[PDB]
Design a protein around this ligand. Sequence first.
Ligand SMILES: O=C(c1ccc(Cl)cc1)N1C[C@@H]2C[C@H](C1)c1cccc(=O)n1C2
Ligand SMILES: O=C(c1ccc(Cl)cc1)N1C[C@@H]2C[C@H](C1)c1cccc(=O)n1C2
Ligand SMILES: O=C(c1ccc(Cl)cc1)N1C[C@@H]2C[C@H](C1)c1cccc(=O)n1C2
Ligand SMILES: Nc1ccc2c(NC3CC3)nc(-c3ccccc3)nc2c1
Length: 337
Amino acid sequence: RPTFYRQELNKTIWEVPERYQNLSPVGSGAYGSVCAAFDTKTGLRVAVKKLSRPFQSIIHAKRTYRELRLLKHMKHENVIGLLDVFTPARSLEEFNDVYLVTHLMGADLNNIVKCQKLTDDHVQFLIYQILRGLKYIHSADIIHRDLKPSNLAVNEDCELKILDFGLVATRWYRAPEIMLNWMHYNQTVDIWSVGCIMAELLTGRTLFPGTDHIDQLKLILRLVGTPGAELLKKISSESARNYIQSLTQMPKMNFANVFIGANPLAVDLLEKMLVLDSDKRITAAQALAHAYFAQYHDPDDEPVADPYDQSFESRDLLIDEWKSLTYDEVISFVPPP
Ligand SMILES: O=C(c1ccc(Cl)cc1)N1C[C@@H]2C[C@H](C1)c1cccc(=O)n1C2
Ligand SMILES: O=C(c1ccc(Cl)cc1)N1C[C@@H]2C[C@H](C1)c1cccc(=O)n1C2
Ligand SMILES: O=C(c1ccc(Cl)cc1)N1C[C@@H]2C[C@H](C1)c1cccc(=O)n1C2
Ligand SMILES: Nc1ccc2c(NC3CC3)nc(-c3ccccc3)nc2c1
């Protein structure tokens, strides 16, 4: 066991191995607060994330478990990975805190776009990297579910990683089917989000800045058009079907008339990503092979993931059970080479 030391930063006491030095608060998310630190083992600047109230409730405990399971799985250039996980607890009995250690990236994509529209070349590279990471995540039958600029980190080399959570309204980036059904949907919900992000990088503006869920869908249908009969016939919920059928008919827009002056290949890709019907939306693997990425695409360096056991997602367990499973995962952790 390493030697731990204690310090108070903000409202919270941090107890970490002496390996991590010069902790400095950088901010907090919904699921925890984060300090930048110097990692004496690697010489790297790292992010140390202390999860908030990890075992407060059943859903908190299951969320903590989920977070650790997902982070332990991710081994890809374009996805956040786990450098270390630790607890100051010496036994399961006293186990109440979870710290996660990851690479510290320079900024998030919200910071970058909040002043600038990016050149097409830089958009190619950023979206390429997001899709490369997504191919990997999706290959493990994992859906991210919350891709947005604040959940994408970039360093000074313009290298990008998809994050677990950031430190920008989710609804603005959410696929329209997450309002119309739930039976069900697929990995392309993340592709919708990528489309929204790409549009924003190209224009400097949020594509669909809805004030609420009704406004959100209205803004979406103004671009992509109101559903045709062929899509309507695939909607199982009477209320959802009647909701969208009661809207005033909006024709689909030619995206070239919206993203004026953009690379025609960029516009073509956006047309394929922002399809209303998720059965017809482009996949991450398909998108990587799109002509827009001709400068970057390498079918032999776009790896897939090891299989991920998400059977736990369907289980209903007690707080101490999720807590015990989380403890197992801390103990079994093997640091990356
Ligand atoms: O896991 C998802 C989910 C969440 C977001 C996205 Cl983009 C895709 C699927 N769902 C399973 C259930 C019901 C729906 C869909 C849903 C929508 C929004 C949040 C949420 O937790 N859930 C949980
Ligand atoms: O499933 C994930 C998730 C978690 C970790 C990683 Cl590495 C990728 C995605 N997310 C979906 C939403 C919001 C974020 C991101 C999130 C982070 C951590 C736990 C969690 O339940 N959630 C639920
Ligand atoms: O059938 C609906 C539903 C869906 C959309 C609209 Cl506008 C109204 C009701 N719901 C029943 C459950 C829970 C909620 C509401 C819901 C919201 C969005 C999608 C969905 O499948 N469901 C399934
Ligand atoms: N094969 C499909 C394809 C698309 C779908 C979709 N997308 C519409 C843009 C909202 N929505 C819904 C649905 C079903 C029940 C309740 C709420 C939504 N189902 C779909 C099934």
